[PDB]
């Protein structure tokens, strides 16, 4: 193949390993998000239990985590080093972390009011 794949192999593999582990954790986040809602019901009985699930909220949260996953795919494909025009790579990791933070904040808010 092109020798560039070998020249950039170090950044490519570092991004690929880190960001795919994150992508797998984003699938895990789809499922952990619904499992956490399930516990917000199972133990706590959140006041919005009738609405907190359904196609609407389940699809919305896994779509948020899918946005996270899309960027983990985008990054794992290998952005190489953060040159001045490529400074969005680890910035996108913070945006991935924002997708995750929004989900964690959602779960907190869904469990903040119960019984």
């Amino acid at each position: 193949g092109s020798p560039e794949f070998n020249r950039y192999s170090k950044e490519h593999m570092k991004k690929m390993m880190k960001d795919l582990e994150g992508l797998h954790r984003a699938e895990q986040s789809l499922h952990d998000l619904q499992e956490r809602l399930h516990k917000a019901q199972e133990e706590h009985r959140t006041v919005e239990v009738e609405k907190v699930h359904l196609e609407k909220k389940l699809r919305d949260e896994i779509n948020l985590a899918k946005q996270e996953a899309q960027r983990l795919k985008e990054l794992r494909e290998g952005t190489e080093n953060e040159r001045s025009r490529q400074k969005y790579a680890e910035e996108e990791l913070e945006q991935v972390r924002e997708a995750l933070r929004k989900a964690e904040k959602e779960l907190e808010s869904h469990s903040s009011w119960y019984a």
Side-chain angles (χ1 to χ4, degrees):
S2 314
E4 280 188 294
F5 295 118
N6 301 109
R7 292 292 185 270
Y8 307 141
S9 61
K10 78 296 186 195
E11 297 308 304
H12 176 78
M13 72 180 73
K14 282 188 293 117
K15 288 290 284 159
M16 185 179 176
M17 187 64 200
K18 185 256 290 181
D19 296 303
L20 276 183
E21 199 186 66
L23 210 169
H24 193 43
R25 288 193 191 92
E27 297 178 296
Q28 190 193 311
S29 82
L30 318 167
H31 301 327
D32 285 2
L33 269 31
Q34 37 250 198
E35 208 265 7
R36 292 254 196 178
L37 289 179
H38 201 85
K39 299 226 184 303
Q41 177 183 306
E42 190 176 31
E43 296 297 308
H44 295 85
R45 305 293 188 282
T46 162
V47 298
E48 58 170 4
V49 54
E50 302 185 315
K51 304 169 288 173
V52 88
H53 294 108
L54 310 174
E55 291 187 17
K56 294 187 180 183
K57 213 266 144 167
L58 296 171
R59 185 167 55 230
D60 198 55
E61 74 189 7
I62 76 178
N63 185 244
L64 173 65
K66 188 177 182 180
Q67 176 57 34
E68 198 183 329
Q70 153 59 36
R71 296 303 228 188
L72 286 155
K73 164 205 169 300
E74 197 175 314
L75 292 178
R76 75 93 206 183
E77 274 163 24
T79 59
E80 240 288 325
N81 80 93
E82 295 199 299
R83 228 70 185 167
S84 321
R85 294 186 180 179
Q86 219 92 333
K87 65 155 239 68
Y88 98 102
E90 296 303 300
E91 181 196 295
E92 199 66 58
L93 188 71
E94 284 283 79
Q95 293 179 61
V96 143
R97 195 185 186 184
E98 196 164 3
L100 191 148
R101 276 173 288 177
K102 178 175 175 285
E104 281 285 290
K105 180 62 186 179
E106 276 173 37
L107 292 176
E108 187 192 66
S109 68
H110 295 309
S111 55
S112 293
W113 301 283
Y114 63 92

